[PDB]
């Protein structure tokens, strides 16, 4: 039908039921091309994306335990290389909006009485949103008791609160994240440890916090890799999207050189936080002098701006 769209109908069903549009429109095939959706935003990390996609494909084919969340993942490796981005993108694609991602920072869940806070910070959030990606950040800091409740989610896709009434988790996607090993790998490189030492050290620290009985309940254990220079160069480009869209209103083009992107990349990426400090770097190195250039009148309506590297920082040109 022409005047009435698929979206029009889907929205009605979506609003009456509470089922996301995406979920109603999953079949109209996208599951086949879900890796490319996630690639629009998550540069690199091809293994992590396939994992997540393969897990979701299995649940959608009716091949997994129905009494479980759709997917359960442990995302290991360094921070700032795509974990949160992926989690968000995952929510936006499967459940329409990033607002459909619940983030539990386990730093607040270390001192025993933290279970009650969950059961109901967690249980209430998943009560009003049955269709949600749940992001447990740095899960290794979490207290044992708080870890026990997480297993209950992994066992039957449900969880009891204070009243006794169970909250359904069978439509949720659980992503757990941790750095464990990475800071340690950084230690041994700065301390000149032999490879096998570092490798032995990481393994035992992982064994301490995550015991087989818990990992067995997970769909995939993903280890995120550090980014290559080329991957970072694409991360720079993506991060510019908003600025470039802001300038585009006044028909202003922002055209960086090869050296320019590397410059930002160098200072906006480090092995500790990955690419997380890049935003502030862009804002300081490029967005600052550009603002000055505009307000000085040296950059105008429709102007094409060429960004190059220099000795002082970034140099700007008008052709």
Residue numbers in the entry: 518 to 545, 547 to 637, 650 to 849
Task: Quote the authors verbatim.
The molecular chaperone ClpB, the bacterial homologue of Hsp104, is a disaggregation machine that provides thermotolerance by resolubilizing and reactivating aggregated proteins in concert with the DnaK (Hsp70) chaperone system. ClpB belongs to the family of AAA+ proteins (ATPases associated with various cellular activities) that comprises a wide range of molecular machines which utilize the energy from ATP hydrolysis to remodel their respective substrates. The AAA+ disaggregation machines Hsp104 and ClpB possess two NBDs per monomer, thus forming double-ring structures with 12 potential ATPase sites in the active hexameric complex. We determined high-resolution X-ray structures in different nucleotide states for one of the motor subunits, namely NBD2, of ClpB and combined the structural analysis with nucleotide-binding kinetics studies.
We therefore crystallized ClpB NBD2 from T. thermophilus under nucleotide-free conditions as well as in the presence of ADP and the nonhydrolysable ATP analogue AMPPCP. Crystallization experiments using 2-propanol as the precipitant yielded well diffracting diamond-shaped crystals for all three states. Structures were determined by molecular replacement to resolutions of 2.8 Å (nucleotide-free), 2.4 Å (ADP) and 1.9 Å (AMPPCP). Most importantly, our structures of the nucleotide-free and AMPPCP-bound states are of significantly higher resolution than those available previously, allowing a more detailed structural analysis. The nucleotide-free structure contained a phosphate ion bound at the same position as the α-­phosphate in the nucleotide-bound structures. This single phosphate ion forms a salt bridge (d = 3.0 Å) with the positively charged side chain of the sensor 2 residue Arg806, which is not observed in the nucleotide-bound states, in which Arg806 is involved in a crystal contact with Glu520 of a neighbouring molecule. Apart from this, the structures of the different nucleotide states are highly similar. Strikingly, in all ClpB NBD2 structures determined to date the side chain of the Walker A lysine Lys601, which is crucial for nucleotide binding and hydrolysis, is present in a completely stretched conformation that prevents the expected interaction with the β/γ-phosphates of the bound nucleotide. Importantly, this inactive picture characterized by a stretched Walker A lysine conformation and the absence of Mg2+ from the catalytic site is not only observed in our structures but also in all other ClpB NBD2 structures published to date, independent of the nucleotide state.
